Amino acid sequence: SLQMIVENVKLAREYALLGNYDSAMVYYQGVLDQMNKYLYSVKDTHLRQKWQQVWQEINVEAKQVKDIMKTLESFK
Amino acid sequence: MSLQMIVENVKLAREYALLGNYDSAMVYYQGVLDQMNKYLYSVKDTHLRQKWQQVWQEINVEAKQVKDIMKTLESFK
Amino acid sequence: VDEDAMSQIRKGHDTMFVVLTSRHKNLDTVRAVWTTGDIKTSVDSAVAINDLSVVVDLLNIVNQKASLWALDLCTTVLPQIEKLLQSKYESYVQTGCTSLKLILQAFLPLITDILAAPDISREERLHKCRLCFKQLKSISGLVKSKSGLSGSAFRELHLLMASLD
Amino acid sequence: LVDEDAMSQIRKGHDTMFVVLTSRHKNLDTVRAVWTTGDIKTSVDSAVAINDLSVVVDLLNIVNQKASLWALDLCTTVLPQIEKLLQSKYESYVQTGCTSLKLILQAFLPLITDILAAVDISREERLHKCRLCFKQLKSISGLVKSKSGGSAFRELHLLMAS
Prior knowledge:
It is classed as hydrolase. The complex is a heterotetramer, with 2 copies of chain A and 2 copies of chain C. Chain A is mainly alpha-helical.
């Protein structure tokens, strides 16, 4: 479902904006996998290329959340 | 100037210092050092005076250690 | 459709990048002050950053760790206090009484709430909480026995420890 | 009481004082070094590990004199942020502010109340920050009472009855 990928992207970003990084990471990892399964479901090669940069941009957001979490783990 | 009072005030300074009451110890240490120095120049004998000077120095050493302890403690603030 | 789906997802990417990068940078500023050990200026720097989301992130860490910090402190300090309360030097006893009062005032409410509750972090708190309560019960008997002296500090401590008898 | 007897009585105890204060200062400096590195935890363990009760007394005397002032300084810095969190449109911000406020009320309010009771350059400063703290709490109190009309604010309301 495309509406699920869009929705799950929205949730990951909302959780991240609110500092709920645990829940954000679950959805970021969810969308990255879900986006990859739809990616190889795409028969068009060009449409596949454009989704790959969406995956890349979402992947960048997920790495920043991890970096924030790693910083927070130092306070322990 | 009573010598038995100087002995007592040395005893008080040391007791407070042993117990970690450094503010009160310094009051008596500065007291004895002044009281002993005021008595020191009352001594006309040269030999008797030198021996009191080394007593004063030993008390001064103890007073300096208390000061040093207080300075170390003030670092924690 | 793909065009609407991708357009909606990419719409928000630049804002997310800026928010998370800036928040990460601000947290790193605070973390640097924290590792030096200065609790005061690390709280001050978070406020000075003037970013409520950084304050939220840090208070969320404090809120989950504060009780464990207090419990760890208590389980190390209480045996020392017990020694002080048994000292033949009056001032040592007085020092132990003052420190015990502060612990009871500040930390006993937290300890009560932990023992009154329905993963690994909760189990660790409950474990240290139970030891801490064991130490306080031991100290409690000492406090009650010395409240018969006249000696008044032990009667105030007895009152603060009423929830243990 | 003659001079020779007086000097003998005084000097008898000098070597003991020198050694005791030397050992204690060395032990306190050992603890201070761990403290200045910033690790509060291993610095407490340092004093215990030294196993010298007089070092513990000196350190607890400092803590006993500063702990309430530390809580007071922290509260007057944190409470304005907490009040902002309680006013946020984000549910999770409010919950964070409520949780931090409960811990502050449980742990630090008893200490701060006692400061107002019982020469001293700081005393003028202490009372000013005490009043600032109670102004902050009074402001939060009215907000808590209004929003208790929700369960977290009822728990907070009872903690703020005073």
